[PDB]
């Protein structure tokens, strides 16, 4: 099992950048994929990316050349870089664990942060 | 002779990232020095980084390690990407431009934008990276 914490949130301009963490906690954190979801509010949670426990990644379409997933095992430490952020970014962002699964459904985790929000201005603003 | 504009800003938790851009109107961009300077409240507006025509940089000592300037010519664009962000990088950031400054001294430069906004979170909202 292991415990997840989310990190990094704030409201930005559109065309900016952010970087979540989600830092982990319990054993064999490197057996874990680890996905990153959204939930915007009256909205279903969704994929955003993966990350496999060798490194291969997967991205929504909605994110792709935009975000990039990332892992530092000795620090037991998953990122999203988020740049050129927009309007539909806007969420609450998860960090997803999981030993048996690295899909892009949310039923595949098992173990879940409790969340950071990320709001993006309207374009041109 | 350049007109600037600043974004990028926003309120980001301690420990977060942002990554203001600077983009430039005028002719010759890349003969052009950038500087950013930040002015946080009753705070003068002190220096941040600067990139020269060159590529050459220059950190302030508060930001070295956590802070990287660039520049894209070609998009007439320079950047400030800021990792583990602080209370003490609460400002209004700058970027300003100059063909003839290679020096700290805000009054070498003489081309300014409005300025961009950024607000970190206290320390203790920042968790205790690995
Ligand atoms: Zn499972
Ligand atoms: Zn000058």
């Known amino acids: 099992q292991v415990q997840l914490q989310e990190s990094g949130g704030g409201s930005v301009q559109a065309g900016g950048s952010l970087k979540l963490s989600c830092?982990?906690?319990?054993?064999?954190?490197?057996?874990?994929?680890?996905?990153?979801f959204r939930q915007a509010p009256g909205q279903d949670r969704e994929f955003?990316?993966?990350?496999?426990?060798?490194?291969?990644?997967?991205?929504?379409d909605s994110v792709k050349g935009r975000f990039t997933i990332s892992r530092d095992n000795a620090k037991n430490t998953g990122y999203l870089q988020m740049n050129s952020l927009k309007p539909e970014d806007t969420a609450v962002?998860?960090?997803?664990?999981?030993?048996?699964?690295?899909?892009?459904?949310?039923?595949?985790?098992?173990?879940?942060?409790?969340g950071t929000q990320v709001t993006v201005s309207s374009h041109g603003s | 002779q350049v007109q600037l504009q600043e974004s990028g800003g926003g309120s980001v938790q301690a420990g977060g990232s942002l990554k203001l851009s600077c983009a430039a109107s005028?002719?010759?961009?890349?003969?052009?020095?950038m500087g950013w300077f930040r002015q946080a409240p009753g705070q003068d507006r002190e220096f941040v980084a600067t990139?020269?025509?060159?590529?050459?940089?220059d950190y302030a000592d508060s930001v070295k390690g956590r802070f990287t300037i660039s520049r894209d010519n070609a998009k007439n664009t320079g950047y400030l990407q800021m990792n583990s962000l602080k209370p003490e990088d609460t400002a209004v950031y700058y970027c300003?431009?100059?063909?003839?400054?290679?020096?700290?001294?805000?009054?070498?430069?003489?081309?300014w934008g409005q300025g961009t906004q950024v607000t970190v979170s206290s320390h203790g909202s920042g968790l205790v990276p690995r």
């Open positions: 990139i020269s025509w060159t590529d050459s940089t």
């Open positions: 300003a431009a100059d063909r003839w400054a290679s020096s700290r001294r805000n009054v070498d430069y003489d081309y």
């Open positions: 005028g002719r010759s961009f890349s003969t052009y020095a």
